[PDB]
Design a protein around this nucleic acid. Structure first.
Ligand code: OGA
Ligand code: MN
Ligand code: ZN
Ligand code: ZN
Ligand code: ZN
Length: 418
DNA sequence: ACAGGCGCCTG
DNA sequence: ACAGGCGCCTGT
């Protein structure tokens, strides 16, 4: 749509686009309803060189941290190299520091932990391990190791639609065994949160939100939420889960992912130093040498203030499995280094530090992203809980696509009698 | 090409 | 507890 594209980064506008960074501020000021220092914009440069440890596990090289209590909205923008059009600068990440009420976040942290640690059924995903399938970033204790728990509806290759095509009364929030009371409590928590987060999605990313509500009245059984405007279809809970570098390839194109962060009780004040902390990382990006307004000194001031933490290399002892985890059916200590990624200035690794009750928005299908491993993961008392709300592709059929499935296999009855 | 996935169903 | 069915698409 311009006469100015390959490895400039993925191109999309449904989070926000404009001719320059100043135009982005006008948009974000109009969306959020405030002006000035409440909105913070950081320029990030796409390099395409993935930051990773010597074992291939997520690392951060720069940490964007909330500057002050006056900073309410954080926006990461990408200036597409060599573009002078009206989409030369696009938005790739939005972070509402004060996303949900803190009493709700305090309450959700303990309830989801206690429910999921006891009755939760673990969902094994590809990003749970590094590429050699031998890391131990989640921890090796099966009772305490970090884990992913997915709920709602999901896309299925066997139906090219919702996985509940053959499910009479599907259990969107299934827990171990058959405990309807406990599943109802978990359902109410995540349904209330989907309901609360929906208007925030619409306010700050209206174009992407509008794309996810297009077929709301055609396939309501594949949507979450209890009020009009239901952009989410599935939700995943991540308890001390180290998501290795990945894209969420099942998500619907031109959509986005909303992540609500809940943190351990030792990491709930602004001016505090927690014992451990999980970060959300964009491995293909470096930070700019300049701030939103084009000042080098403002960027250098943020680095010395801590608003942009410039990390250095590390060498830590980690565990590596003696046998890779099998696709579909002991250990030894090893040094994991990071010096190689820090010696190359163009190797990426821009992270944000999500706070208790914050809400993060990003197009997780297009942008490579990851979460750092915890020093001592423990899903019974996790450092970080992330609730990831998304809508998968081909989720626009009523009743989980039941009518299309039995119509497809009714065609087999016609082919059978031949 | 092609390995491998935020699966659930009947029997 | 199990076996076997239903098969799409993306990064590379
Ligand atoms: O937890 C986060 O911040 C990001 N989570 C994911 O990307 C995921 O679970 O797929
Ligand atoms: Mn993800
Ligand atoms: Zn790992
Ligand atoms: Zn252009
Ligand atoms: Zn469904």
């Amino acid at each position: 749509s311009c006469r100015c594209e390959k490895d400039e980064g993925p191109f999309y506008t449904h989070l926000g686009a404009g001719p320059n960074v100043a135009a982005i501020r006008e948009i974000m000021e109009e969306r959020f309803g405030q002006k000035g220092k409440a909105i913070r914009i950081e320029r990030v440069i796409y390099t395409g060189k993935e930051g990773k440890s010597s074992q291939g596990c997520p690392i951060a090289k720069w940490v964007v941290r909330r500057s002050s209590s006056e900073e309410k909205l954080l926006c990461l923008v990408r200036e597409r190299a060599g573009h002078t059009c009206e989409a030369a600068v696009i938005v790739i990440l939005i972070l509402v520091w004060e996303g949900i009420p803190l009493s709700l976040a305090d309450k959700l942290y303990s309830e989801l932990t206690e429910t999921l640690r006891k009755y939760g059924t673990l969902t094994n995903r590809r990003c749970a391990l590094n590429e050699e399938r031998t890391c131990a970033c989640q921890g090796l204790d099966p009772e305490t190791c970090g884990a992913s728990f997915s709920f709602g509806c999901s896309w299925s290759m066997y139906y090219n639609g919702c996985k509940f095509a053959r499910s009479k009364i599907p259990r969107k929030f299934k827990l171990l065994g058959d405990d309807p009371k406990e599943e109802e409590k978990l359902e109410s928590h995540l349904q209330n949160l989907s309901t609360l987060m929906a208007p925030t999605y619409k306010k700050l990313a209206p174009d992407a939100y509008n794309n996810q509500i297009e077929y709301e009245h055609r396939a309501p059984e594949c949507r979450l939420g209890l009020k009009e405007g239901r952009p989410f279809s599935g939700v995943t809970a991540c308890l001390d889960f180290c998501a290795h570098a990945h894209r969420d390839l099942h998500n619907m194109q031109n959509g986005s992912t909303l992540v609500c962060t809940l943190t351990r009780e030792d990491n709930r004040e602004f001016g505090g130093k927690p014992e451990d902390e999980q970060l959300h990382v964009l491995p293909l990006y470096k930070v700019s040498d300049v701030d939103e307004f084009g000042s080098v000194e403002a960027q250098e001031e943020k680095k010395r203030s801590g608003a942009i933490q410039v990390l250095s290399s590390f060498r830590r002892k980690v565990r590596m499995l003696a046998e890779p985890v099998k696709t579909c059916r002991g250990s030894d200590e090893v040094w994991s280094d990071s010096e190689q990624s820090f010696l190359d200035p163009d190797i990426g690794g821009v992270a944000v530090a999500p706070t208790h009750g914050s809400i993060l928005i990003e197009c997780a299908k297009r942008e490579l992203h990851a979460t750092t491993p915890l020093k001592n993961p423990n899903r019974n008392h996790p450092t970080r809980i992330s609730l990831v709300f998304y809508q998968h592709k081909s989720m626009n059929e009523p009743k989980h696509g039941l009518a299309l499935w039995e119509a497809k296999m009714a065609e087999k009855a016609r082919e059978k009698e031949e």
